[PDB]
Amino acid sequence: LDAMKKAGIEDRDLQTGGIDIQPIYVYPDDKNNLKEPTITGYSVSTSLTVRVRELA
C-alpha cells in the first residue's frame, strides 16, 4: 500500500481485511512412502482492494 499511496491513490480509495490462512502440503508420489499428505508450512493472504478514480 506504501507503493500505492505513492503510486497515487489516497487513503480513501484503499481497503483491507479478510485474512485467509491454510496449510501447504507434500503430496504422495513415486518416492511416496508418505501416507496421504503431510504439512510443509502454511500460506497466508489478506485481500486488499484499490479503487482507481480517473479511469484513464
Q: Which residues pair with 49 in a beta bridge?
A: 15
Site residues for a copy of itself per CB under 8 A = 12-24, 26, 29-37, 39-43, 45-51, 55-56
Contacts of 46 (CB under 8 A, 6+ apart): 16, 17, 18, 19, 20
- Between 6 and 35, whose beta carbon lies closer to a copy of itself? 35
Residue 2 vs 30, nearer CB to a copy of itself: 30
Residue 2 or 22 with smaller CB distance to a copy of itself: 22
